[PDB]
């Protein structure tokens, strides 16, 4: 399976470069100056015509249209990808507008598309606007802190299994879920300021944990419900979807070690679906996803 990490804009090119220091990287920008600082092997300047003689003040809309203009070139850089990771990293600029369009393009190619947001936002507004557009355009949105960025590439295969699970849940509409946001690590986010992006009903929150070695099942399950969002939400949650995936060394009894951690954290009357996959391509790592819904 081919994975592609796409960095869009000032922040995204800076995101890609830190990650570069088994994944193809692609750097997209309306600003060709920034494109020369990229160590990406494949770089794409978008909106050459639209941006001629432009100066400061470049907004999201410029970048959105710019990406539509260079659509074919974006398609040729994504050709053959099974999964795609798109980020516009920190900061503003044109990437905020372009990154959704890039995501939308890869989806119509049929790649599983994941939006990575590291830029702080709150909804209780320019950054926040960008987050909403990304979320309409991707299969799954994951919010993660910037200092934890390297995890999405360091544990890309476990996190691959997590986003497939999220894409499956969101399309089947399991337990009525119609809208889903994923979280990794300690995020500065509050339910209040996320409930606005998400649906009036059927919204869900997914935590992820990946771990290996001694006590791995329990530490993954712990990591999964550790971020503020999950910690608060899983308590009142009416439904919980739990999944642990591992390779041949995982046994049902180890899996159950994780399921117990989560079940102790959800309240007593929860409707909890617990799944366990043994998947050889995982080797020695395990991934725990905990999906909460029904707030």
Curated annotation (Swiss-Prot):
Documented activity regulation: Calcium ions inhibit the GTPase activity and promote the polymerization of FtsZ.
Keywords, alphabetical: Cell cycle, Cell division, Cytoplasm, GTP-binding, Nucleotide-binding, Septation
Residues annotated as binding GTP: 10-14, 18, 56-58, 93-95, 124, 146, 167
Annotated GO CC locations: cell division site; cytoplasm
Places the protein is found: Cytoplasm
GO process annotations (BP): division septum assembly; FtsZ-dependent cytokinesis; protein polymerization
This protein's name: Cell division protein FtsZ
Organism: Staphylococcus aureus (strain Mu50 / ATCC 700699)
Gene: ftsZ
Residues of the whole record sequence present: 12 to 315 of 390
